[PDB]
Structure formats: structure tokens, C-alpha cells
């Protein structure tokens, strides 16, 4: 229908140049796709109550950040318990349950050369409390990431380490840091004090670009909606900043004081949700997909090969979604690196993977709770139907839509190799 092609900036998406794409952007072309950039909300006195946390989950919070620069272990354990209580209050409806990751943001090295003794204690607390992600403060070199990894020990091998780049050395040694990290956070607060303020946008754009090229999550952080700490509406520079972080290629956008101590924590989440949805429809996928395809090296890994074939197939038919079965989240991450317009619905039995895939733009995790079927092919089909039923309930899919389904040839992580075109009935 004609109406389909008038929505989600589809006239601007069909443009032959980026300049023409900009000219065709329409404030009346409503976004239809689900919001794909994750919202990280920092937990504090304004967002700690179980009832307030339920409102924030409904508004769109995907990751709960615990800032270990403030508060004791007792304070953070209570925050964790309140987050988990608010998250599990929706578990009664498995088709609409939304997993929420828990990220521990470290205090940092301070004047010392490497890992502080408080960071070692806080990291062990994170492992003991089952945190999903570590936002490692002031990472300056690859050995800083290795020290964080060693402090997590053998039980914390599954925790994702997102390195915070906050100073000149971190920016200069970026490639070596990204190589050993699971992702990056552009920590603009400290970065804007360590380097000239007028240069922070160059560091942000460079880091987002390099993370997109590497296929690793990148978080844009600090003062995105600062004025909303005390005011109900953000400034014109703030909405522009959020939209441009998404247009730059950020996987995640963050709220610090806006949710930790502000008067509008839920409204700050709703604002980031609204801007991100508008900005994602304004992404010029024609150039972005071509450039990601061109920049990506040849690969003999079947997951990587299946992912690009599936994204190409999704664009060919305007698939509403790519439904992927994943154990670690990796198959969903490799799909996400090609920035499909289709939602990546990731069906998993791992509660930790369902939480961690929020780091990857466009990945919508579904936690499947049923015990495995005796016949593995039936177990596989049941999970794909779970992804379809949740997708229909949430508005991702309708009858008549085409979906791309991504599976593997045997159970266990690392064997994704199949892509199939499916019609929604």
C-alpha cells in the first residue's frame, strides 16, 4: 500500500543521495518500527522504588546502571533487588516480559596507575550479585581491561566489559582497548574536561564509527538531557544531541542524573524513547548498509556468513523482523552489526544473554522459559513460534508479513548456519 511507503521516512530512505535523503525528511512521516537504540538509566534516589522502576521499564529502560562512585555495597545490593523485583513483576506474561540488564559502573583508578583496591572489591561484588555488564571507568590501555577481567575471576567470564574512554590516552590507544573489550562507552563528562570541549564531538563520532566497523556495542553517555534533571522538557540542543547520537551509530544512549537524582526520571526515559524512534527512521540505510558491507572483511565463520545473507534477504522483502535463536547473544550481535531496518527478535533460554543483547542496537530479547522438547527440531520450532507470538502481541508483526528466521544445525552455541524466509500466518 501507498500508506506503508509514506511512513517511517520511506520517501527519504529511497533517495539516491544523502543530500536528497535530508531534503525528503518529513515531520509528518510517523515512525512505525520499534525503538532499536537501548536506553541505559542510572539508578539512584529518584529511581530506586520498585513502583518507579516498573514505570521506567514500561517507558523503555533496557539497562539499569549502578554507579559505584556513590553508595555502599548495601545500597547497590538493594538497588539490584529492586530492579529484579520490578522486572520479575511482569514475568507472569511471558509474551510481553522485558529483560533488563544490570550494569556496574566502576569508581575508577583515580591517581593510581591501574586497578584500585576498591575496584577489586566492587568487581567481586558484581560477580557475587550476578551483574551482566561492567562499565570500566578511565580505561587507558589494553592492560586496564585485562586487570578488570582478572578481578572478575573465573565465575565472571560471561560478564561484558564496556570500556569507558574518558581521557586523551584512552582516545589515542582506542584500537588496542576496543580489541580486548566487548564494547565502548564515550564518557563525555570526563572526556570534556580531559580534552578541549570543542573536540568531544570528534572523539564521539570516531569511536562510534570504529565500534560500528568492529561490530561492537558503543554507548553515548552524559548530559544528553541534562536540563530534564529539574525541567519537564529538554532544550533544543538536548533533543538534537540524542537524535545525532543515534544518527552517528550509537547502540545505546544513557541517562545519568536525569534518572538517578532528577525530578523527571520516567519522562527522561520517554523523551529518549521518542527521539530515538524518530532518529532511527531518519537513518539513511542505503548508504549505511553498503558501507558496512564494503568495510566488513571476508569471513569463513558460518554465523557471520548467515548474518549478512539474512540482512540482505530482510532488505529484499522489507521483512518486519529477523527471528534468531541464540545462546550467548552472538548470532543476534552479528545480525545487528549490519544495521537491518527489520527488528532482530532474539529468542534465548539464557537470562544473562537476554539481558546483555540490549547492548546491540535493534536486538529485542525474548526469554523462553519452557524445558527443552525431546525432539530438537520441535524445540527449535516452538521457540520460533514464541518469537512470532511475542512479535504479534507487541506490534512487531502482523499476518501477511515476511520474517527471516536464523537457526543452527545442531544444539549449543556457535553453530548458526541457516536462514529461512517465513510468511506470517
Amino acid at each position: 500500500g501507498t500508506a506503508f511507503f509514506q511512513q517511517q521516512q520511506l520517501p527519504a530512505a529511497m533517495a539516491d543521495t544523502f543530500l536528497e535523503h535530508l531534503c525528503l525528511l518529513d515531520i509528518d512521516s510517523e515512525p512505525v518500527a520499534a525503538r532499536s537504540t537501548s536506553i541505559i538509566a542510572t539508578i539512584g534516589p529518584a529511581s530506586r522504588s520498585v513502583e518507579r522502576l516498573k514505570e521506567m521499564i514500561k517507558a523503555g529502560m533496557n539497562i539499569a546502571r549502578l554507579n559505584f562512585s556513590h553508595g555502599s555495597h548495601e545500597y547497590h545490593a538493594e538497588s539490584i533487588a529492586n530492579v529484579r523485583e520490578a522486572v520479575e513483576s511482569f514475568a507472569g506474561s511471558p509474551l510481553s516480559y522485558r529483560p533488563v540488564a544490570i550494569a556496574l559502573d566502576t569508581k575508577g583508578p583515580g591517581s593510581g596507575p591501574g586497578l584500585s583496591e576498591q575496584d577489586v572489591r566492587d568487581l567481586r561484588f558484581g560477580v557475587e550479585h550476578g551483574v551482566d555488564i561492567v562499565f570500566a571507568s578511565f580505561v587507558r590501555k589494553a592492560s586496564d581491561v585485562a586487570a578488570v577481567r582478572a578481578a572478575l575471576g573465573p565465575e565472571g567470564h560471561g560478564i561484558k566489559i564496556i570500556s569507558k574512554i574518558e581521557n586523551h590516552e584512552g582516545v589515542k590507544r582506542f584500537d588496542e582497548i576496543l580489541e580486548v573489550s566487548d564494547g565502548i562507552m564515550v564518557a563525555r563528562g570526563d572526556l570534556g574536561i580531559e580534552i578541549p570541549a570543542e573536540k568531544v564531538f570528534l572523539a564521539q563520532k570516531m569511536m562510534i564509527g570504529r565500534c560500528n566497523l568492529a561490530g561492537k556495542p558503543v554507548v553515548c553517555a552524559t548530559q544528553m538531557l541534562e536540563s530534564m534533571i529539574t525541567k519537564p522538557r529538554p532544550t533544543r540542543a538536548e533533543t538534537s544531541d540524542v537524535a545525532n547520537a543515534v544518527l552517528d551509530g550509537a547502540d545505546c544512549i544513557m541517562l545519568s542524573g536525569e534518572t538517578a537524582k532528577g525530578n523527571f526520571p520516567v519522562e527522561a526515559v520517554k523523551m529518549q524513547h521518542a527521539i530515538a524512534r524518530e532518529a532511527e527512521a531518519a537513518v539513511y540505510h542505503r548508504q549505511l548498509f553498503e558501507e558496512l558491507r564494503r568495510a566488513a572483511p571476508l569471513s569463513r565463520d558460518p554465523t557471520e556468513v548467515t548474518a549478512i545473507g539474512a540482512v540482505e534477504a530482510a532488505f529484499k522483502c522489507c521483512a518486519a523482523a529477523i527471528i534468531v535463536l541464540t545462546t550467548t547473544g552472538r548470532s543476534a550481535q552479528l545480525l545487528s552489526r549490519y544495521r537491518p531496518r527489520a527488528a532482530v527478535i532474539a529468542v534465548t533460554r539464557s537470562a544473562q544473554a537476554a539481558r546483555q543483547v540490549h547492548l546491540c542496537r535493534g536486538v529485542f530479547p525474548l526469554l523462553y522459559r519452557e524445558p527443552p522438547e525431546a525432539i530438537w527440531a520441535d524445540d527449535v520450532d516452538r521457540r520460533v513460534q514464541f518469537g512470532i507470538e511475542s512479535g504479534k502481541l507487541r506490534g512487531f508483526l502482523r499476518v501477511g508479513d515476511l520474517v527471516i528466521v536464523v537457526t543452527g544445525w545442531r544444539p549449543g552455541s556457535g553453530y548458526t548456519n541457516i536462514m529461512r524466509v517465513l510468511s506470517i500466518s
Copy 2:
């Protein structure tokens, strides 16, 4: 994992270039072709190429389609030619490394002075149906109704025969779109075309028709005087080798030999020359731009076969896949893969002898006729044909242990349900 030698062969330095100009600059006469020859060779059967022994040599040299020119000879003469082709083809049933299907094409005499289908073309088309020909090269197609007349003449039994319309005059060129729409493919019949329009304009008609056929995903044949001097000489001129290479680089699915094989002194050598040039020219194709342009020009599709095909070709390029193995009954799944011009060979596994012969019209499709009895469990039968394609691939040199192959199948039996693409590691 593959080695530096792998990336020096088959013009891979030129293939990785960022511009077409740089691609040309990187072409290397020392970069040897490794991939199997993907552009089919059509050889016209005549007095110089009719004997069963000569036909065996032509099959070994690379002939994929045997052309019977109904402008010369009687039905009895052509039936004997057909029987000799089939005898030469079946002489390799004892060697899997050599049994290759060969299509039989009937080239019509034409309408002559008359308006539509001639009495003789009607009788000759009937002969083709009765003798089980795979393809009709319809002479002097001028409009869509000419194709409908040929199609109507393919009686109740011959609706599966492919109609390749020969464009040989100004009207055929001008009404090209309407002709291509109702035809299975096109032949740029340069002999008559070069007499009907100014000779210096034929290259424009050839390039335009090949481009439109590539955009439509329909077979296009480049024909006439490609290696003309080889009718009396053992080596072609510099213009002739250039012409064969440029037909492949233009986007032709097939290249043809007429007098060179029908009446010449070197029919086998003419086939060998076309084989050698096509292999070199296929490695020199600038896939980076070709794939992007085919992708961009092709419209969005809700047909799972079309969606699977582009996903599979994208996957093949990503891993330098040795091959795309496709299960096909009509050949359609192999044809949709072929339209995206993959560098990987498209190994088409079919139980249909006719589809095996007819897929020679599509560039890069290597048919394998499968004759094992069907399995009770369908998924087992699918696995069996996939493994058959892998093992013939290994036997013929297409594949080795450790290679990656893309596999295209459907979710249920019967034609029309292709929707699956898998990445398999060769064990």
C-alpha cells in the same frame, strides 16, 4: 587459511579494486583462471560436426548446447543429428567425471516474406516437440504476437520448451521490451541484424539487449561470426578473441558457434577457443559493481525464491564460497541465483533431465541430473541430493574438504517453495 596464492589467481587483485578503472589496471595475464567455465557454448551441428566420434570430442571440448539449423537439411537429417548427439552424450554415462547433459536447440528457418509463422516453421516446431528438443531459437521475432504464435505451435506437449527469441531486425530491436516480456530469453542474431541495421550500430543493439536481459534475469545469447576466421584457419584473429571476451564481459549467458562448427575445418578447436576465452573473461568480470547494480536495479520482492537467491549470493561473496548447491526441479531456483552473477559456481541438482539440459541457458549453472530412487523421509532425500552435489563437486574439482558451500533448498517438496539458505563446511 587460503594462502596468498589463492588471492593472486582468478583476477582476485582486480576483483578487490575500488573503481572499474583500477579494476582494469589490475588485470594480470599471469593470474590464472581456476573457476569452472560458466558461459555456455552453443555449437551448430552440421557436416563438420555430425559424427558420434566428432560429437564426443566437442562435448569434451566444452559444447553445452547443440544447435540444429532448420534453414538447411531435412527432418530426417536433423533426427539423425539428434540421435548422434544423444549417443555421444550417453557414451559418458559410465564416468561421473564426464557425464554432462547437453541441451538440443532447434533454430527455425523464419517467416521469410510472410507476416507470421510459416508453414515450414509450424512443421519444424512440431518435429521439435516430437523429438524432445529443449529450446527453440525463434528466427526473426518482431513483436509479442510472433512469440505467442511459436508458443501456440509448441502443441499440447511442448509448453516446457524454452523459447529464445532471435532479434534480427530494426522492428525486433524497437519492440524489444514487449518481446522479452513474453520470451524465455533472447538471441542477439548479429548476422541478419548487421544487414537489417547499419553494421556500425550492431554493438549498441547487443549491449542494450544483454543489459535488459540481465536486468530481467532472462538468458541472453551472443551469436554469429564470433570466431568466423576459424572456419578455414586453426587460430582466430585478434578481433575474434576480443569479441568473445567482450560478449562475456557485456553479460551474455551463452556464446554461439555457427559455420565454425557446422561446416568449418576446425569445429573442436573453435569450441576449445571459446572455452579458453570465456574462462579468462569470467575471472575479469568486475563483480563488485555488477552485483551492486543488479541488487539496486532489481525491485523489492515478496517471492521467497527471489529473497533466498539474493541472500545466498551475498553469503557466497562473503566467504568466497566454492559453490552454491541448489535443489531445483524446473531450474527456476538456479536461474534466480544466476541473475545475481555469483563468482561461486551454481551446482543445480535436479531429478529432471529436461531442466538439467535447459539450465545451460543460465550463466554459471552446472546441472547434475540425480537418478536415485526417492527416500521415504523427505528431509533424507534432500540431504542425499545435497551430498550428491558436494561429492560431484569434489570429483570434478569444484570443491575440496574445508571449503564452504552455500546450499539453497525449500521447506517442503515440489517446485515453488525455495526459502532456505544454509552455510555448510565440506567434510
Copy 3:
């Protein structure tokens, strides 16, 4: 590398490390982003003009001199506040600060004066106060009118009529502040000299989360049309009270420049804030960084692909001159202009080279600040008897002022754009000159 090797040996590796030149040579936009370097220092003069709103914090002659030195190019008078007497005093103080630097072209900086109207209010068209204020603008020789709440072409015809026969030279920049203005954008741009994305009202008239779409669409259409576009409101809002902006504010200024804005504006930051000079310095610092980060390879190709073929020799010369400037990494394009139009056509192709515009019109020298990358030089030397000698003298004046100001160096290549006969509209010549 081979496409920049001889010039790398000639100019040196240090030349190609500065002004984001490694990012500028990238083959894709993604690679361009990856190559952005915080240590790659900007070298070129700031090309995006800064409009500063004059008010109690920025009205004194001494403060205005500091703002001109900080980088203010256009002084905005907001007619929503203050009397005609108040604005006439503001104008006189701006002119006094401007003329305090008039001893030489090396120190002189023309500053345009823009009148921002109160607006229609609840009424359908031009208010009686707007008619009076527009007549005040003509009488006080304002260069630009920022017309508030333009909703259709007839609104700009009414502003043009209220300016009368004496105000035909005044540039009308239409402020788009509501849904109707955005929807009827093409008809408004057609009859306007330029556009202002007035984000303050726009953010209240349409959903706040959609303002960035309106800004990017309007900047893109203005760039395609070759008309000035101003990005306005809350760019450095926090600097009204604080000496440093927030991370969203520096990002907003940089992104307005990267979007393609010709001008960036300061309202409360300079009119009533505690740090008006620091707000100007911050915009100057960010614009210089953002201009070097522009991906000229794609921008120039897209401006060429989107622009229709032209039989206007000024338009043909402009693209040839910009192409020539990119081929040799020209330090400047020196153009002779009566109305500013030849400099504007050069500016639409977004050259990396500075466009030094030599003119005798004081008004054109002020108004060309609306065009990104145009540096106006007001020529006051006595005329030559022979027209060809007079042209050559103005070209040499451009080169001398360029050299003494740091824009040009001995050894540089400069592109010179002139016409074949006197009078506006005859530009048709492009010359490649080596600086000695």
C-alpha cells in the same frame, strides 16, 4: 595514497595530518568518521558566521568590541523587546565598535545588522507594529530582516512591501517556527533570501522530538537551493549562567555546522547572559573544529549531482573554480563581487578554500556573512582609469590582505574569479595564480 603522493612530498606529511585531511581523503563516510582525530588541528579560518543577539549584556561599545574580536559577524536586534530608541542606540553602539577597527582592511571587520521582527501574533498577516519596525529598519540602514513566523509566500511579500522602495537591498531571512511554515517550506524559500530554523517556537508548535527532522530537511533544501540557512535557539543555553557549555550543547553546535548551516546564532547567551564573549568564543572554537570534519568528498559530489545543468556563466565559473581549488588544495578563492552573488555561488559548492570577496559595496560586505566561507573585504582604494587595471588592483588587494592576514602564504595556489565587463552579473573567468 598515489592520488595524494606527489602533493604529500611537496606540502609534507604535517600538512596532511592537520584539518582532518586523513578523514577528508577517506573513500566512505564510515571510514571518514573512523579517521577523525582530536589531535588534527584546524588551520582554516572559521567559515560559519556567528549571529549574536544584542541586549543589556552586550550593548556597551567596549563589550561590542570584545564580541567583534571574539568572532561576531552579525548583530541581531530582537524587536520583541525594547523601544525604537533602545534599538537605535544598540545600532549606533555596534557601528561605533565596528568603525573603531576601520584603520585598515587588515583590522576592519564588517558586521551586519539584522532586525528580528516581533511577529504576527494572533493576527493573519503583518501586524501594525511590524510595519513600524520594518520602516525603522529601512531608516536605520539594517542589512537583514529575520521575519518571524513566516507561514506562506504572501507573508514574505508583505514584509517586502513594508520595506518599501528604499529597502529593496535588505535581505529577508524567513523564520520557520510552526507546522505550516515547514509544510509550505518550498514556496517560502522560493521568495526568501534565506531561512532561519527558529527552534524555540518550532519546538513548541511541533513535537520536540521532531525538531531535528525539520532542521535537517530545511538545511538540506537551503544547501540544494544555494540560499543561506541559520540554525538558531538554545545552542549554548546553559552558558547564560555557566562559563562552560554542556556536552549536548557543543554537540548541537558541531552538528548544525555538519548539517550544512551557513550561520549559527546566540540569543539569551549574548543578550542577557553572564558570559556573552565566552559564548561567541565557544561557537567560534566548535565551528572551526566542525568545518574541518565536513566530508567534502561526498558533499561536493552530491551538490554536483543534485544541481541541474546551467547556462549562467557565474554558476559555470563557480563550479570550475571550486573544482580547481580542491585539485590543488588552494588556500583561497578570491572573487570580485558587486552584490555578493558570485561569492554566494562559490559558497554553495562548499569549498574547503576560503572565499575572499572583494567588493566596493559596504552593504554587500556586511550581507555576505550570511554565506558560509565568505570573507568580505571592503575596497576603499582610489579607482584606476583603465577598468582592466582596476580589476587587477582589486585582485592584488585581495592577495595582499590575504597574505598579511594569514589566509595566504608565499608558495600557495589561489583561484581568482572575475568577469569580462564592469557591472554585476558578468563573472565568467577563473585563474590559477601562484603566490609570490
Copy 4:
């Protein structure tokens, strides 16, 4: 009607595939033929009357094959060419200069320059030849030996290196660096390397020469069958069209004109095909790729050339009129493959003959009286290019032209591009 001719619908296409789809056999070529025709002079084309017909048919360069015939035979050929060329000097606005190229016998089994090549090269200098087609060039030192044998009097002669064997192809870059241009000598090349690989060598060499901005000639068996038949084969017309589409500056005729029964018809056939093939060139991609690949430059002639070609495409300029002493300014314009004709106005007779090596350069030998004021003299040569262009069909009143001149007399000072309206 303007946009229906010269494949302009195909020229406006957004992809090369769409460009091919839009090629129209009814879209007539209107631009003058840009690719020069080199015709080999022999028994079938030696008479002054025959040579006049070949000049009218389109011959731009006369090739003397020193593998056959004596010095007396070649001197007579040269004199007959010059007599046929000067028979048209009565109409200066339509006079066509014709270059004379000497094709050497070659080294044979020898390591360097043979004694016959030294004698033949000295003959060329003494008879004022414009170009040397140096046979079997295998390395840069082979070009240096040819250059030394030409001596101080043969400084101005262009050396076009013939690549005819494996070594020449492998050492191509070093050969091109010291040569004025290249000839893809397909006859010997097709015997020295496998025949099925010659097209790879041709396309690589044409591409590298286009990148370097140096003339490249496609040679041998282009219309071979026309030695005995009045019409060529379908492979032959395709070969001529593809050499032009590949980017060749010149196309050659050997036996077709030297000994064949239809030398004039062979020239007419190459002219007709080249005109059709030049209109089918996809300039949108070609200009962008040549523009992207041409390195950054601080040479004002180079900078003016790109500005002028960009300006010509922006206004659909009928021509770029350039003033040149050595031909260099016209060559730098030619390397960007403008659709506009490059009308090169020169006082040098040798430069007018030699610029035939550069595709799209139409030489005008200026023989009008000088003007006292240099500025007036320049403007007069510009009007001469405009009137010659008007007479020859190139230009009409109302057209736009780009004019490329310098700031002072003498070679090497081009730095000005101007947009001029015709009449």
C-alpha cells in the same frame, strides 16, 4: 530533440546497467569523431589521389611500416602523404593536419637497438616524422636507446612503445614512465602470450595509460576481413567499438589499408564505428573515476584542465578551445575525457600533427597574420577556433564554450579558463 541524440538518455542513467539498457540504435551521433585513425601506407594506399580519399574518409596518422620497403620507397610515401595533405591548404578553416609515424622493424634476436633501426630512426629525423612506433619494447632502456638514436634533432618526436611480448607487459609501468605513449601490438602479442589472454593485456594497458594521461593505440586485425571483403565481420565491428569503449586514444589499420582491396572503406568503417562508440561512452562514471584517480596537483595547467572539463560538463559546452604550443594543455584536457571537443589552436605544425594521439583533440594550425598586442593575438586565435568550429559543424550561435589560455607567451603558462557565449 537535443537530448534524444548522441545517446543522451543513456548518458543520464544512474547506473552502468541502466546506461546499457538505454542505448538506442536510433539515437544518432552528432559529435565529431574523437578517436584518431592510424592507417598503414602501402601499395594499396600510396597514390596521392588514394591518399586524398583516405584523408576525407578520416585518416589522421599515416603509418610507415619499416619492416617492408626501402628508404627510397618510404621517402616517396612521405612525399605523397604531404602532397595529399597540402592539397586542402586552400581552405584554412577546414584543413586537416596528418601526422607521419615511422614503425620500426625491431630488434629481432638482438639484445638492443639493431643497426637497421639506427639507420631507419636517422631517416625519420631527416624526413621530419612526428612519431616513432618503437617495435618490441621490453624495458625502459629500449626506449632510451630509441631516444638516443633520434639524436638532438629528434628531441620533439613522440615515442610510442609497442608492447608485443610477455616482458613488455610485465615491465609495463617502467616502459610507460619513459614513453610518450603505448601501442597494444596484438599481432605479435597474440603469438608471444596465449591468444585468449591478449584482451587482458589490452584492457590493463588502456586503463593504465588513461590513468597516466598518455596516448594508447589499439592495433592489429581490427577489420582484418576487409583486406579482401567490402564489409567486416560482426567480431570486427565489435572489436573497434570495444577498443573505443575500453578507452583507446587511437585505432589502427595495418593490411586493411597497406595491401587490401578496400583501404578507403576500412577507414570509413572505423570512422563510423568510433563515432557510434564515443556517444555510447558512460561519461558519468568515466569522468568521476578519472577525476578521483588523477592525483592532486599544483601545476596550474593541470588545475585549469580539471576546472575547464568540470565547467564544460556543467553547461553542456560544445567545445573547449585551448591555445597550445607543444600540445600539452590539450593533452591535459583530453585525459579527463570531456564530451566537449577539445579544439587546439596552435602555430606549431608538428604539435598539430602530434595531438592526433590524444582522444578528442581537434588540431587547428594557425596561419592568420599576427596581432601587435599579445592580448589581441590570443583573442584572435580564440575567434579562429570559434569560426573553424562554426564551419566544421562543432559550434552554433548560442552555444557555450570554455576557453583555455595562459597569462604570458610561451609554453607552460596555461592558468585561465573562461566561459564564452557563441556569437
